[PDB]
Write a protein that binds this ligand. Structure first.
Ligand SMILES: *[C@](O)(C(=O)NC1CCCC1)[C@H](C[C@@H]1CCNC1=O)NC(=O)[C@@H]1[C@H]2CCC[C@H]2CN1C(=O)[C@@H](NC(=O)C(F)(F)F)C1CCCCC1
Ligand SMILES: *[C@](O)(C(=O)NC1CCCC1)[C@H](C[C@@H]1CCNC1=O)NC(=O)[C@@H]1[C@H]2CCC[C@H]2CN1C(=O)[C@@H](NC(=O)C(F)(F)F)C1CCCCC1
Lengths: 301, 301
């Protein structure tokens, strides 16, 4: 039945995307009820960005310094406040398309959908993982700032990411919707570096189970192993240690396939030690770590 | 800035997805104006599907044999007709969320976004290519039938795919919105086979340009080649021949990077002849053929 990098349907979030302008700076905002959330660096000039004092920069602004456009209609700003690295703009109209929503802070290894936006206009949607080093491997150009990441459980949108910056390795960094950065990054145009990344082991194992459920079995073997002996090989290949919490989460997939977790661990070990020898798994020549156990169950129903 | 398999925002299509039930068969339909489009096999029992006569099966049905649910509201059917492999259900309410739309039949090598749907509820969105053998490498379970594929240009949705079936290789087949199958497939549970697939050469070249635009340059070389000598190596690696039409389409990417098309061809030749030697391009260990030149320009702005 097949296995694809699948994003959440983006309709509930499209209806919240607006354009926020302050002087010559234009980026994207999220309009929920009578509040528009955007990156605070909207109030910055090129010069300010080298070493901004945001509190100073903001006390020098008024409501009228902020143009908020929902498509054609201009929303009148009637209030502003900063929360960490996000600006909150109180507007005179509650968004009639406000979905059921929450603000959630995701953990490294968890996945979410990104709605790339330019000038408040949705451009595309794709799935990302919060990397262990708190970066995301996104696709973001100038104008993307204020684009959000989200999960949809039932009809409730859980917002977990707002886009702020690109690092020199070509990966991306931003905040939760309360304005707290993921990882040790700051909203200043200064030399900053992604820390060394690791492979999300539990997600590789989840993807191996997805493979089996779709009829790729070539990489399986009769062997098993212990959490301990497996984790020695993980250490060696720059893979996150696997925990009992990780084995427990892989349970439903373990049952559905009848392959024990520590049996599937023995498969990963041999793949790590010998490579794939010109073969592929779910159309990849690399071990994929951007599917969670939940993503695999969800998609393989 | 990064490169991702990116789907169109799915909002305009979510607002068109309905559930169609006929007896015990439930699948998805597309509600545009006062018409609901769905797979004609909705009128089939398990038994009928082994060798249906659809004309017969349909003449034995009335408007009242079709329950159409848009979320919680039931739409009253006031007409029905078959067009090839699609059923058209005239309903008593024009869809207030009908976007600007077209029905288009796409060519092999072209891409589109799929909104996977179950019980008329959007489940996920992802990008697909119409393969040269007229299959798509989708992710579709029982209940997916009636799920649509589409491109969005300006605010106009061009619908190009409706889902009908899975082939034994685990790839998928269906129709345009006028009910004509892509490829030599029929809507009957009988032994049918995907033909041998080729790699979309123009899309691999487009993806190499995307690579250069994002700073992957390792695979470039000083050499060039001719269309003919390149096509000799394409033949050998099960790659579609490249045409002047393909070279012309790659022009804007050729210009933007200053790498001539036949220069980038000499790179593909060496990648085909010697492989990648443990290196990756845009995070893939395989040559990717599901990005069009348009997809690369659009995303790499
Ligand atoms: C974002 O602000 C944006 O989209 N703003 C638009 C409105 C005004 C101009 C465009 C922008 C998004 C990135 C641009 C390229 N790809 C992106 O994802 N972010 C930034 O430009 C961001 C600002 C805001 C906080 C810090 C500064 C600098 N910055 C960066 O992304 C830079 N990164 C760094 O300085 C650092 F080293 F990572 F810290 C990039 C440096 C290379 C060139 C592109 C920007
Ligand atoms: C689709 O009709 C559906 O979703 N309908 C729902 C309502 C009733 C039950 C589910 C369904 C979608 C596929 C099922 C698995 N994944 C899919 O993409 N299509 C079919 O089942 C389709 C019907 C309609 C036209 C032909 C028959 C048979 N069929 C198939 O997909 C089978 N393929 C073939 O018979 C053939 F060889 F390709 F010709 C599949 C065979 C094995 C896998 C399950 C069905």
């Amino acid at each position: 039945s097949g296995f694809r990098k699948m994003a959440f349907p983006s309709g509930k979030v499209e209806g919240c995307m607006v354009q926020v302008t302050c002087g010559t700076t234009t980026l994207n905002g999220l309009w929920l009820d009578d509040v528009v959330y955007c990156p605070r660096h909207v109030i910055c000039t090129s010069e300010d960005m080298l070493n901004p004092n945001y509190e100073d920069l903001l006390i020098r602004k008024s409501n009228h310094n902020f143009l908020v456009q929902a498509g054609n209609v201009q929303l009148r700003v009637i209030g502003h406040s900063m929360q960490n690295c996000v600006l909150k703009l109180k507007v005179d109209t509650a968004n009639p398309k406000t979905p059921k929503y929450k603000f959630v802070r995701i953990q490294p290894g968890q996945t979410f959908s990104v709605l790339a936006c330019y000038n408040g206009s949705p451009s595309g949607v794709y799935q990302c993982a919060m990397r262990p080093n708190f970066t995301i491997k996104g696709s973001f150009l100038n104008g993307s700032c204020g684009s959000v990441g989200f999960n949809i459980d039932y009809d409730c949108v859980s917002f977990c990411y707002m886009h702020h910056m690109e690092l020199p390795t070509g990966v991306h960094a931003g905040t939760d919707l309360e304005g707290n950065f993921y990882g040790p990054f700051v909203d200043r145009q200064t030399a900053q570096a992604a820390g060394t990344d690791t492979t999300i082991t539990v997600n590789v194992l989840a993807w191996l189970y997805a493979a089996v459920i779709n009829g790729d079995r070539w990489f399986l073997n009769r062997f098993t192993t212990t959490l301990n002996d497996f984790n020695l090989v993980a250490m060696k290949y720059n893979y996150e240690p696997l925990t009992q919490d990780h084995v427990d989460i892989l349970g439903p997939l373990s049952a559905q396939t009848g392959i024990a977790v520590l049996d599937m661990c023995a498969s990963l070990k041999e793949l790590l030690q010998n490579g794939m020898n010109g073969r592929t798994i779910l159309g990849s020549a690399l071990l994929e770590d951007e599917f969670t156990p939940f993503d695999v169950v969800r998609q393989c129903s």
